């Protein structure tokens, strides 16, 4: 809870998470700014959804307790918005939130919640530009895995026949266009059924919720 | 195909999972819709349907503020006597000093005493009515104060009246009782009961219609009784109203010390009235007009603490209870309206639940007195047979779920050792089990509630509820015209204030203990018991009415075609009356003139010739374009609720709803208003029955209009996104000019090739290039304060040319610019240059933003080359509004100061304006202020968080045009609106001169 | 709102209102919406004819007032429309965003005449009159036309 | 329904409410409308009425006696409407 | 930024719509350095302001 | 219509319900005193 309090209120602030000590408060971290005050107690809502009484006063690492006894593993609401919004405008043409993980476990070893923590450390640090090199963005990846090491404590050919599946997948593609068959209708049409279920399951939900089973019975 | 499937096989890709799936769901969907459609054909539509949820914590709205409809209360009863709206004989002056009364503050006091004491008794005979009766109020409120607030009906007591007219015309009326006055002798009149009640089973004359401010004086004083109403009651008889006991052979009849304890009761409460400070109160069933809302009435002039539901939920309906709450609302006294379906076992659980639940979960932490579920449908010519969804649905709210209910806060109550507080539970009983015709299955549940009689003894929450079966009589409300006739017989029929009171008698102290000791039954049904065959008799004096009215009216239509026969239809044709019907005459409504000799009295004789008229600003015109149409409408709208027809008029003139028309119409010659749509004529008496429904839906704070905005729609609000082309893009066709406009941006990203042909290029973009991809997003802010729907500066005359070349904030400016002329009496602003130099008149209007709508063509439509003017930048500007108007109308030389300032411009344009003319800059300018609302205007008011969310203020039962509410406990941010308005100003003396109206003094 | 109401009722306070007198006010916000600019204008106009027709409007949607509000004992916040038996001066404020401050007090025409000689007044109640003829006359043109 | 009093009246009950009172109803009321369907104005069905002496004397009836004392109404019923020639009320206040 | 820089969805602060305004300019002088409860009157003038 | 009393009298009985649920406690607890001192009378058997 405290480096997801703290990506998000540097985020917000647009300061590195070193110029901001979890030791202060929230209205010493605004200055004045109200609107600022108003939005990372908005954002900080969406994220944890349990609203200390007051957000503005309890400073943030006293904030970090009340928030890690009813969060865990969450990536939360905001921050994943916040994460899938720096994957979009700053990663390299192709480089995708799915793509970035395989990377740091491939090579930097990183399950699951570990690569969490590798991502909301690249938030803060976000680059003003968006990244040309695929290298390049493996490079940005590298150096924010370890400013998540020391900062958590730790220390660090079926290719061939995917180059060719693509083509027959594009082989196909191509010939479905000149047979005008929609290959994704099946897809739709299933889709839509699943939703009037969820829609008259529900209904029945309530009259039984209303008239109870043995009644309904 | 072939090579398709071959290829597929090789991806290993299922062609056809894609119907498979769909195949399967397709099936569970007619298996769920089978057992709605089971459950439908077993419950009915009625049942399934009206048995849907309908309460929500966040639709509830509590009354609070007692502290401030009291001055209100009193500030109104005392411009209303001095208008003489209220004589000193009128029982409302009475009325409402009880209310006044009833919240006594230090501070209600200061304020009587401010304005009692600054009347001048000489102004009028009003004016002294208004200085006494205050004088007498301030001393009661002064003698009330630190006093229980109390229940006191002192309405006028009615009884049923039918008359039948000589030609068979059947009218229904509610006249005074003869020899009943006050409740005090309406609780005598009880007591002494009628002939018809025959074996067993005091003059304090009031100051009352004649001299209210005698009466008012009398309010304020305990009235001592010997002579207790109980001991007039006959030997061998029975009161009207009484209470029963139940013999140890099990029947209920009448026992005389309990209708006496209960009938001294009622007495004592005629008198002094009873308090019910302290006390919680759920009622259901206390719509308008019905026995309910004038219990609640009741309890709120006590001081209680009320929970009211209702099932249609409205402004309408809120609106009422607000109303309601500021006259009875009684110090400490407090009202929650929730919405609320007693059908629903989930509406029952989830009430009484926010009920019980602490104020910081979300709840109101009470905890029940009483519980008063009236809460009923009407189920009507519906027999044996007919029983059915209805009738079953309606056995549920009348019976079943009232179990449920009181079984809920027995929970409730024994969840928290709540052992010594009851709920007293009012049941509502009948006297008539199936006597009547086709109830439905009303009887059955009346009749089942009785079971609590005993259920409270032989079960086990005889400490948290206590029964009070209450047998309602007869009673009149909005089948009546037998009511005089039934109570021909020795029975009393009641009006609804008069059970009301009834009903608030078992709630008083006295009767409440009787019940906590075993379950009270309340006989409240007027000796009807009595009168035997009570289906026949009742349906025959309705048959004897029914027939002497269509004999008499059928008589008279025929002697009156006899007449038409025997005497020509030519001589009674000249007999019948002309009817005139009333057109609109708008008014452009000046000042009013008094004589000087009235005018002198106002200000100070010392006056005359003190103040240099060239430094007094005077305002000499105004107008305004807004969401309620110009300031003649708005006005009317703001001032009094609904349009004359002068309104109306206008409106549908305004909003283009009818068009003026001269000539012939299909033949024969008009001259008038005509549906502008059909070409049909129309008639003035006519405007609001065919317009003002859809004008009311389509002006003042409503849903954003996207039609009124180049299609701005919050839900669907359209941005661009960028991502990069992950592989080459199939070329497209493009102009040489174009295509090199591409390859310029994008270069080693793109390929453009001339097609040797045609002479134009093909434009392929590569991977790596820059792609904008359209996405929508939804927003919260979904309500405006809009111009009526259908203005359009076209009407108000101005050329199509304007129109184009002007940014619409322009076009509000230039149509008030001349509105305000035209209230000034200024019909050619030339005119100003027959009394003043070109140099002197000016122009200090200003704007906010304004231009809005051409910033975004200059920023947005310019960015995507859509083609846009090549002077919107002119347009942006917030100083060409007044260029426009000076360029268009005015033609002056004079000052030409414009104000910035944000939601504020238009009184710091006065400012500014005020000055110029002191400066001797100008005589006379133009000041007011103008702003457009649009798409990217309203989103960053969101995102500053300062309008209201539109999405809360739906989850809260706000309608849109609720959503404006100033200094109230919910205010939730603002609501934003569009338009202009300006005023004229000048040197009084040239005012003075020119003659024009004065509206006032800046 | 409550900014508002407590420079306000200070304003009072420190001038000497009378106790017991409050100012009543009124907010028309509530029927027209917000236009930024336009604001002050439109509460100008309903000053005016709040002047000349004595009628003070109700705020309409004022459900609950603010219990906050109830220590300004020198504002009055009525929901019901009072037809009065006569306004003498109100007060427009508005306050805008970037301490955009501003008041304005506007007196009852009928004050203007006390300083002006008799026969003065009687010409001028003349020319006002003829004017009214021919602009109703105007207006009921441009209307139709 | 045993052992369940007011507070326990829920999903069980109502549905015996319905067997034991609505249902009853709508049972009499389907023969009256198929005797009138036909003319059947001289043969009358008679309809004993299973009723309680014992309306909520005892414990947790569930919504028993509620049942038991609304069929009372038909006592009335039988005067005030329009079924007579085809049903006709004879109730017995089944003992112990 | 308000009217473009939002078009794209690139980041963009939550009051561009304060700093915007032609009077908010003369505000942030009061409420950096002056501190005045003065007058605060704001001219459009365009070329001549 | 005809209404039929086949109640055999419990309508005088006063009090029905407590004297039923007297009846009741008296049969029970004099069912289990007699049971409950007989199993320990008959330990005190095996024991002695």
């Excluded at chain 2, 065919?690 to 009311?696: C, N, V």
């Excluded at chain 2, 704007?847 to 709508?853: A, D, I, L, P, Q």
């Excluded at chain 2, 109308?889 to 414009?898: A, E, F, Y």
């Excluded at chain 2, 005020?914 to 100008?922: R, W």
């Amino acid at each position: 809870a405290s480096l997801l309090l703290h990506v998000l209120v540097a985020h917000k602030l647009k300061k590195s998470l070193d110029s901001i000590p979890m030791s202060k408060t929230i209205k010493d971290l605004v200055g004045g700014k109200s609107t600022v005050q108003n939005e990372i107690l908005g954002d900080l809502g969406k994220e944890f959804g349990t609203t200390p009484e007051k957000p503005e006063e309890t400073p943030l690492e006293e904030l970090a307790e009340t928030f890690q006894d009813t969060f865990s593993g969450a990536l939360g609401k905001q921050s994943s918005s916040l994460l899938s919004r720096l994957i979009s405008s700053k990663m390299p043409g192709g480089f995708t939130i799915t793509v970035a993980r395989k990377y740091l476990q491939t090579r930097w070893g990183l399950p699951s919640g570990r690569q969490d923590g590798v991502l909301l450390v690249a938030l803060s640090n976000e680059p003003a530009a968006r990244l040309g090199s695929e290298a390049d963005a493996k490079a940005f990846l590298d150096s924010m895995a370890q400013k998540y090491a020391s900062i958590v404590g730790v220390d660090l050919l079926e290719e061939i026949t995917k180059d060719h599946k693509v083509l027959a997948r594009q082989q196909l593609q191509v010939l479905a266009r000149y047979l005008k068959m929609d290959l994704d209708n099946g897809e739709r049409k299933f889709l839509k059924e699943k939703d009037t279920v969820a829609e008259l399951q529900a209904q029945l939900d309530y009259l039984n919720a209303e008239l109870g089973e043995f009644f309904v019975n | 195909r072939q090579q398709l499937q071959v290829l597929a096989r090789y991806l290993k890709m299922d062609l056809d999972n894609g119907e498979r799936k769909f195949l399967k769901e397709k099936d569970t969907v007619a298996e769920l819709q089978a057992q709605l459609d089971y459950l439908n054909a077993e419950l009915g539509e009625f049942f399934v349907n009206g048995v849907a949820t309908s309460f929500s914590r966040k639709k509830a709205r509590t009354f609070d503020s007692s502290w401030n409809w009291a001055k209100q209360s009193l500030l109104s009863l005392y411009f209303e006597i001095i208008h003489g709206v209220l004589k000193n004989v009128d029982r409302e002056v009475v009325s409402e000093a009880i209310n006044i009364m009833n919240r006594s503050n230090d501070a209600l006091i200061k304020f009587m005493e401010y304005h009692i004491s600054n009347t001048d008794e000489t102004k009028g005979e009003n004016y002294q009515l208004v200085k006494t009766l205050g004088e007498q109020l301030i001393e009661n409120c002064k003698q009330v104060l630190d006093v229980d607030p109390v229940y006191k009906d002192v309405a006028k007591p009615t009884g049923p009246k039918t008359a039948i007219d000589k030609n068979g015309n059947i009218t229904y009326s509610e006249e005074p009782r003869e020899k009943v006055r006050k409740l005090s002798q309406y609780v005598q009149e009880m007591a002494l009961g009628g002939p018809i009640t025959k074996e067993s089973q005091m003059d304090v004359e009031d100051a009352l219609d004649k001299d209210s401010t005698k009466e008012v004086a009398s309010l304020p004083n305990k009235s001592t009784i010997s002579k207790t109403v109980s001991s007039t009651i006959p030997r061998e008889t029975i009161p009207f109203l009484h209470l029963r006991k139940k013999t140890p052979a099990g029947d209920w009849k009448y026992d005389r010390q309990l209708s006496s304890l209960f009938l001294d009761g009622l007495e004592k409460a005629a008198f002094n009235g009873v308090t019910f400070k302290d006390k919680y109160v759920l009622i259901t069933g206390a719509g308008k007009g019905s026995i309910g809302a004038e219990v609640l009435q009741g309890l709120l002039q006590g001081g209680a603490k009320v929970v009211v539901t209702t099932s249609r939920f409205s402004k309408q309906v809120t609106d009422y209870y607000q109303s309601i709450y500021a006259k009875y609302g009684a110090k400490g006294s407090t009202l929650i309206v929730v919405p609320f379906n007693q059908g629903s076992k989930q509406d029952v659980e989830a009430l009484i639940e926010f009920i019980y639940d602490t104020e910081k979960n979300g709840g109101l932490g009470w905890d029940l007195d009483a519980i008063i579920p009236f809460a009923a449908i009407p189920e009507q010519g519906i027999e044996l047979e007919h029983i059915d969804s209805k009738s079953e649905f309606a056995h549920r709210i009348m019976l079943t779920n009232i179990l449920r209910m009181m079984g809920c806060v027995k929970k409730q109550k024994s969840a928290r050792g709540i052992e010594t507080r009851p709920a007293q539970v009012i049941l509502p009983m009948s006297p008539n089990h199936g006597t009547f015709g086709g109830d439905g299955m009303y009887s059955e549940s009346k009749l089942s509630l009785e079971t609590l009689f005993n259920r409270w003894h032989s079960e086990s929450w005889a400490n948290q509820l206590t029964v009070c079966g209450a047998i309602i009589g007869w009673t009149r409300g909005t089948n009546n015209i037998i009511a005089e006739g039934i109570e021909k017989m020795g029975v009393r029929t009641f009006s609804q204030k008069e059970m009301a009171f009834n009903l608030l008698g078992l709630l008083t102290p006295e009767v409440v203990e009787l019940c906590q000791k075993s379950p009270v039954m309340a006989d409240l049904n007027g000796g009807l018991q009595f009168v035997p065959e009570l289906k026949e008799f009742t349906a025959k004096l309705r048959k004897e009415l029914v027939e002497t009215s269509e004999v008499r009216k059928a008589v008279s239509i025929e002697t009156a075609l006899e007449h038409k026969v025997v005497n020509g239809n030519s001589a009674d044709a000249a007999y019948a009356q002309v009817e005139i019907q009333p057109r609109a005459n708008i008014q452009l409504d000046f000042p009013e003139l008094k004589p000087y000799k009235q005018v002198k009295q106002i200000a100070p004789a010392e006056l005359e010739g003190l103040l240099d008229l060239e430094r007094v600003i005077v305002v000499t015109g105004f107008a305004e374009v807004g969401p309620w149409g110009s300031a003649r409408t708005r006005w009317e709208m703001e001032a009094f609720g609904e349009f004359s027809l002068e309104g109306c008029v206008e409106m549908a003139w305004i909003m283009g709803f009818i068009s003026y028309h001269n000539g012939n119409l299909k033949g024969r010659p008009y001259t008038g208003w005509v549906d502008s749509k059909t070409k049909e004529p129309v008639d003035d008496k006519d405007v609001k029955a065919k317009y003002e429904t859809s004008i009311l839906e389509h002006s003042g704070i409503r849903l954003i209009e996207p039609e009124l905005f180049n299609g701005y729609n919050p839900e669907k609000k359209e941005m661009i996104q960028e991502v990069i082309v992950e592989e080459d893009l199939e070329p497209f066709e493009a102009s040489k000019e174009t295509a090199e406009q591409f390859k310029h941006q994008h270069g080693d990203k793109v390929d453009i090739f001339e097609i040797p042909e045609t002479g134009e290029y093909s434009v392929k973009l590569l991977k790596g290039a820059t792609l904008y991809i359209p996405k929508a997003l939804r927003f919260d802010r979904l309500v405006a304060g809009q111009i009526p729907t259908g203005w359009n500066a076209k009407t108000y005359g101005i050329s199509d040319d304007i129109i184009s070349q002007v940014d619409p904030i322009t076009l509000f400016v230039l149509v008030s610019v001349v509105e305000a002329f035209i209230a000034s009496g200024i019909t050619d602003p030339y005119e100003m240059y027959k009394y003043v130099h070109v140099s002197e008149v000016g122009n200090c209007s200003g704007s906010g933003m304004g231009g809005v709508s051409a910033l975004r063509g200059m920023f947005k439509d310019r960015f995507k080359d859509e083609p846009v003017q090549n002077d919107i930048l002119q347009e942006s500007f917030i100083n060409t509004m007044s260029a426009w108007v000076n360029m268009l109308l005015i033609s002056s030389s004079g000052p030409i100061k414009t104000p910035v300032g944000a939601c504020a411009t238009s009184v710091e344009s006065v400012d500014i304006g005020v000055e110029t003319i002191l400066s001797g800059k100008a005589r006379i300018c133009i000041v007011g202020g103008y702003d457009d609302f649009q798409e990217e205007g309203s989103f960053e008011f969101g995102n500053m968080k300062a309008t209201s969310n539109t999405l809360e203020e739906f989850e809260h039962g706000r309608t849109p045009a609720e959503m404006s509410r100033p200094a109230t406990t919910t205010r939730n941010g603002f609501m934003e609106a569009q338009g202009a308005g300006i005023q004229i100003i000048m040197q009084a003396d040239l005012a003075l001169k020119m003659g024009v109206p004065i509206y006032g003094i800046v | 709102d409550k900014n508002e109401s407590a420079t306000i009722n200070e304003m009072m306070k420190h001038l000497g209102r009378s106790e017991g007198n409050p100012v009543i006010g009124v907010f028309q916000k509530f029927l027209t919406g917000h236009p930024k600019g336009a604001a002050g204008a439109w509460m100008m106009n309903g000053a005016l004819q709040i002047l000349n027709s004595g009628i003070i409007p109700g705020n309409r949607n004022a459900d609950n007032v603010d219990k906050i509000l109830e220590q300004f004992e020198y504002v009055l916040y009525p929901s019901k429309t009072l037809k009065t038996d006569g306004v003498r001066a109100v007060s427009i404020t508005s306050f805008g965003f970037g301490q955009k401050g501003g008041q304005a007090i506007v007196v009852h025409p009928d004050y203007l005449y006390g300083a002006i000689t008799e026969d003065r007044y009687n010409e001028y109640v003349a020319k006002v009159s003829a004017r009214e003829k021919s602009a109703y006359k105007f207006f009921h043109n441009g209307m139709i036309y």
